[PDB]
């Protein structure tokens, strides 16, 4: 089997990207938001109080013919940026793009944090990390992604996303028309439940490629790319008038500045990171002073390759025995 599905920026910034996922019988369509830095599919519901929803297509699964209840199982979950979210469980059958999984635990959500509150756009997540980060006591579940592995022709999923556009999620295969070039495959570790890999250096702008092995994850759920204080502040020294703000939370820069590109190593090939992509504009509304969209990792405690660094690839996510990621121009 497999499945397609178009993933689409939730605002002007490409602060996440949302998928459609259909729940239950009948379907119950939710706007997801997937994670590769995660690993539980929870959804706002029927059970979310009432105060902490604001928009948001919820999940009913008194409604649905084939949900049960997975009695005595919980889940609570932190997110890197601060936020959270818990409940309780059930069993329904998931399907995504055309892909469908029975049985797949559906966490939902009795509390959410404001920052899920506030984004009216986001009917939860779905995780695509390894399942041993998945938060379900006393007994842990298995991702979308693992329950459907035994069923696919390939057991790979893909992330092509794009820059203030439409991009996709394939699950099963690879499809060769949607990338340029070749694809460059990479170790991952999966000791601390992540797509953990090893870029190779970097180069900002026309500069020179340094060398240099860069220790991080493959986060589709995370905005920004994270990387050392030392890149970083390579980086923005090229940029007239960036700064690094504590009042402001990380580098900022002049809005009339044009950004230079970043590249980064996959073994012996590079991806491009176009300056724009690096732009996330004023900080606050009318203001000149923009917000830079390469931050340090530093305190975060792993480097971060999020939207801003995986939208300039054609990512592959194979999760045959021995994982690897794969990254190829496009």
Known sequence: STGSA???????????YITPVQIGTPAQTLNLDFDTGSS????????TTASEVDGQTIYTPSKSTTAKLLSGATWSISYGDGSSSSGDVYTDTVSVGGLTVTGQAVESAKKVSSSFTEDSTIDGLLGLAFSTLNTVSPTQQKTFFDNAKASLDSPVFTADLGYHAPGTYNFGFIDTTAYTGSITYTAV????????????????????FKSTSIDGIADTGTTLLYLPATVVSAYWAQVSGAKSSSSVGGY?????????????????????????????????????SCFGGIQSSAGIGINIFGDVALKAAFVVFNGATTPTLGFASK
């Open 40 to 47: 539980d599919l929870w959804v706002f519901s029927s059970e």
């Open 252 to 288: 900022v820069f002049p809005c009339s500045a044009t950004l230079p590109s970043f590249t980064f190593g996959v073994g012996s090939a590079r991806i491009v990171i176009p300056g724009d992509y690096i732009d996330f504009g004023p900080i606050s509304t009318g203001s000149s």
């Open 6 to 16: 178009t993933t689409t920026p939730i605002d002007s910034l490409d602060d996440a």
């Open 189 to 208: 570790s999966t000791k601390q439940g992540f797509w953990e890999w090893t870029s190779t250096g970097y180069a900002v702008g026309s500069g020179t």
